[PDB]
Amino acid sequence: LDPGLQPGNFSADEAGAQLFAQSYNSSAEQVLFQSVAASWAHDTNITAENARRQEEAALLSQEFAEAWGQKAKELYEPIWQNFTDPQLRRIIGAVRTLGSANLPLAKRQQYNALLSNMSRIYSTAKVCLPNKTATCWSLDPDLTNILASSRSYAMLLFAWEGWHNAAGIPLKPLYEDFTALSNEAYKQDGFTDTGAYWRSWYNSPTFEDDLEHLYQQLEPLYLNLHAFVRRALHRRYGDRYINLRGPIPAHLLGDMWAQSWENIYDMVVPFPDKPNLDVTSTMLQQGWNATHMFRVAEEFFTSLELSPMPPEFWEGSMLEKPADGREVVCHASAWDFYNRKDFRIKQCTRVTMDQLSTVHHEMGHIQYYLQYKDLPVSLRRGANPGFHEAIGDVLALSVSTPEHLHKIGLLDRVTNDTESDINYLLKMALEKIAFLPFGYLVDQWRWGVFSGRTPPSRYNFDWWYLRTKYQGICPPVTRNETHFDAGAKFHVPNVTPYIRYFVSFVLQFQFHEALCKEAGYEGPLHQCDIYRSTKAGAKLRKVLQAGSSRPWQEVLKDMVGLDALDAQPLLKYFQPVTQWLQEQNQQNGEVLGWPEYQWHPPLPDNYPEGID
Numbered sequence: 001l002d003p004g005l006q007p008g009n010f011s012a013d014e015a016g017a018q019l020f021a022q023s024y025n026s027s028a029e030q031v032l033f034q035s036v037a038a039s040w041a042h043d044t045n046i047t048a049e050n051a052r053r054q055e056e057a058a059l060l061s062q063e064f065a066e067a068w069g070q071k072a073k074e075l076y077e078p079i080w081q082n083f084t085d086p087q088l089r090r091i092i093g094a095v096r097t098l099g100s101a102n103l104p105l106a107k108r109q110q111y112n113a114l115l116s117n118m119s120r121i122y123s124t125a126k127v128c129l130p131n132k133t134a135t136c137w138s139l140d141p142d143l144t145n146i147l148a149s150s151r152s153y154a155m156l157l158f159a160w161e162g163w164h165n166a167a168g169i170p171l172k173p174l175y176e177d178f179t180a181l182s183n184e185a186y187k188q189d190g191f192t193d194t195g196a197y198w199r200s201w202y203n204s205p206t207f208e209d210d211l212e213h214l215y216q217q218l219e220p221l222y223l224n225l226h227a228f229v230r231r232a233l234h235r236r237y238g239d240r241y242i243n244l245r246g247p248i249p250a251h252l253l254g255d256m257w258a259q260s261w262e263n264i265y266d267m268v269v270p271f272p273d274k275p276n277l278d279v280t281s282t283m284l285q286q287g288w289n290a291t292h293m294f295r296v297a298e299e300f301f302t303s304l305e306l307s308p309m310p311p312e313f314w315e316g317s318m319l320e321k322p323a324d325g326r327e328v329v330c331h332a333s334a335w336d337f338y339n340r341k342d343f344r345i346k347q348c349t350r351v352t353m354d355q356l357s358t359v360h361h362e363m364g365h366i367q368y369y370l371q372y373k374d375l376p377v378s379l380r381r382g383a384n385p386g387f388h389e390a391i392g393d394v395l396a397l398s399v400s401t402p403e404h405l406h407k408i409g410l411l412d413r414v415t416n417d418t419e420s421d422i423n424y425l426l427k428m429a430l431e432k433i434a435f436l437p438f439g440y441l442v443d444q445w446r447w448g449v450f451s452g453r454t455p456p457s458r459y460n461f462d463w464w465y466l467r468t469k470y471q472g473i474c475p476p477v478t479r480n481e482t483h484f485d486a487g488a489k490f491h492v493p494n495v496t497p498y499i500r501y502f503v504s505f506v507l508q509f510q511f512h513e514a515l516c517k518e519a520g521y522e523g524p525l526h527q528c529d530i531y532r533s534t535k536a537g538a539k540l541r542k543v544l545q546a547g548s549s550r551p552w553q554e555v556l557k558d559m560v561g562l563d564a565l566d567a568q569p570l571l572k573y574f575q576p577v578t579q580w581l582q583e584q585n586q587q588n589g590e591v592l593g594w595p596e597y598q599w600h601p602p603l604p605d606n607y608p609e610g611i612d
């Protein structure tokens with residue numbers, strides 16, 4: 001690289017191990033800005049030129065990272081861990097770990113290539129109809145909408161199978177190779193496999209257990225939401241397609257991965273004939289740009305005594321699927337350019353409630369950025385990945401309240417009663433409860449792939465073991481070890497850790513409680529709305545401004561009063577419907593779980609030649 005980016009020498013002393021770092025930070029944000037802006041061009045525009053570029057920028061970083069990497073350890077290793085200012089012993093500790101950059105040049109290029117590609121294969125795939133080579137559907141929007149609102153078994157089946165073959169099969173060979181490399185890289189940095197490296201980020205020698213336990217506490221919650229919906233579904237598709245004693249077919253839950261069922265609310269809503277808790281409809285009625293959405297999400301944040309979106313963001317941002325036709329990574333994501341000036345969001349936005357919360361979710365990342373920019377490089381990265389995924393969801397909780405919505409125009413009217421209360425709680429259950437199993441499962445599968453528990457020889461066989469086992473869902477068509485359904489999930493191909501969405505979902509309520517308390521709210525945790533609460537917001541920002549400077553376990557105590565993750569405040573949120581569902585299944589003689597595992601639905605009638 002430039003040499004004015006290379007280390008320099010420093011002292012084997014602390015007062016000079018600190019001098020090692022003030023430097024790295026000034027240089028690092030040049031090298032980081034580059035690699036980041038490069039990607040921003042590849043994702044905003046997926047072209048061979050941009051990809052080759054991106055792969056280049058990565059190569060620079062990879063060895064900017066090696067230079068200071070091997071240097072930081074050259075002389076700061078056998079004494080670190082005894083550094084008075086550990087808010088620093090942990091920056092040096094972040095630098096001493098390179099990862100891939102401990103990979104010979106050839107392998108690094110292989111590495112970066114795989115990445116570029118997988119994301120391309122994943123984001124480029126499509127589903128085409130049989131006889132008519134007529135317009136081929138894409139995951140967003142076509143496929144998504146078909147799942148979100150089509151009630152044709154066969155049709156959903158065509159898209160579920162279409163997408164899973166189309167995205168997975170080609171992806172498999174690359175994945176196996178990316179894993180071998182990723183491993184090799186961190187086997188250097190001390191860990192055993194990338195798995196261990198990924199879960200060393202919560203600093204809890206007890207992490208996995210704490211999670212397994214925390215799940216048991218919630219499993220009952222899921223199992224009941226499950227049997228309840230499974231039966232509402234039986235009601236609509238019949239006895240041939242649904243088994244009241246078996247796992248649910250993975251394509252009927254209204255979402256490609258069956259990770260959230262809030263899109264079938266109209267089929268399970270307990271007390272219908274009441275005001276609809278779905279302004280998935282009056283957002284359209286009104287006159288709503290995709291921008292209008294990033295504007296309302298904004299306005300909550302302001303009110304919350306927190307900074308608004310910078311002007312750079314408002315323009316260095318992609319909030320709609322472009323018109324120049326430029327194949328893009330439509331996923332929603334938030335970008336931190338490490339230059340304290342450029343922060344943007346990338347997402348192919350269009351007008352659904354479901355996505356109006358995703359917008360908040362994303363703003364949560366941006367707001368976290370804006371808040372901790374004023375610290376070093378090797379800690380921007382918050383308490384733990386969990387806290388990051390939480391920030392926007394918390395504020396989302398308050399927004400979802402029917403009552404919060406009326407205050408802002410999408411819930412015309414009012415009934416502050418039980419029935420409506422149950423409906424609301426069920427809707428939220430479809431979104432947060434139904435996810436818990438999945439969120440847990442994914443990295444469950446991966447830590448095992450990274451560890452060799454699950455060789456490519458059992459990629460799909462161990463994936464459906466986990467899916468059936470936790471979600472109680474089964475594949476609508478047969479599968480084998482030419483398939484790679486794990487790869488059809490945006491996060492597997494783009495190598496993003498998942499166990500943080502679990503942590504996130506459990507700990508977004510701890511926040512919601514803690515915040516509602518300081519807001520001075522009293523009434524029911526699930527009707528609280530920390531709106532316009534400068535008092536609450538100040539409590540949140542203190543955690544934000546903290547980044548990775550001290551331990552999450554401490555930043556958490558200060559904010560919530562607890563040394564760790566707790567499902568208690570979550571149980572307390574859903575309490576009503578928790579008891580309600582439980583009572584309804586029993587009376588209706590339901591069976592919690594799937595004892596008839598191994599059961600699979602039959603294909604439609606002559607598949608595949610239908611309405612599609």
Ligand SMILES: NCCCC[C@H](N[C@@H](CCc1ccccc1)C(=O)O)C(=O)N1CCC[C@H]1C(=O)O
Binds near residue numbers: 331494496
């Ligand atoms: N309707 C699509 C929304 C996508 C939003 C969100 N995006 C992701 C982006 C992840 C990412 C990590 C590293 C590099 C590039 C991207 C996010 O964490 O915000 C997400 O994945 N989410 C949000 C909730 C659950 C999880 C998902 O759907 O699997």
Ligand SMILES: *[C@@H]1O[C@H](CO)[C@@H](O[C@@H]2O[C@H](CO)[C@@H](O)[C@H](O)[C@H]2NC(C)=O)[C@H](O)[C@H]1NC(C)=O
Binds near residue numbers: 478479480481482
């Ligand atoms: C796993 O299942 C797939 C089918 O979903 C099997 O593959 C074939 O499927 C294609 C259509 O996608 C048919 O044209 C082929 O005729 C099917 N092959 C056979 C042998 O019936 C696939 O073979 C199964 N894979 C393994 C490894 O057993």
Ligand SMILES: *[C@@H]1O[C@H](CO)[C@@H](O)[C@H](O)[C@H]1NC(C)=O
Binds near residue numbers: 022026375376377
């Ligand atoms: C580098 O990090 C320091 C904090 O030590 C910060 O003040 C600065 O803005 C960052 N970059 C530059 C060029 O100072």
Ligand SMILES: *[C@@H]1O[C@H](CO)[C@@H](O)[C@H](O)[C@H]1NC(C)=O
Binds near residue numbers: 110111113114117
């Ligand atoms: C990724 O795909 C490209 C073609 O775009 C190919 O040249 C390259 O070999 C693939 N990368 C790897 C690591 O296989």
Ligand SMILES: [Cl-]
Binds near residue numbers: 201385497498499500
């Ligand atoms: Cl994680």
Ligand SMILES: [Zn+2]
Binds near residue numbers: 361362388389
């Ligand atoms: Zn996120």
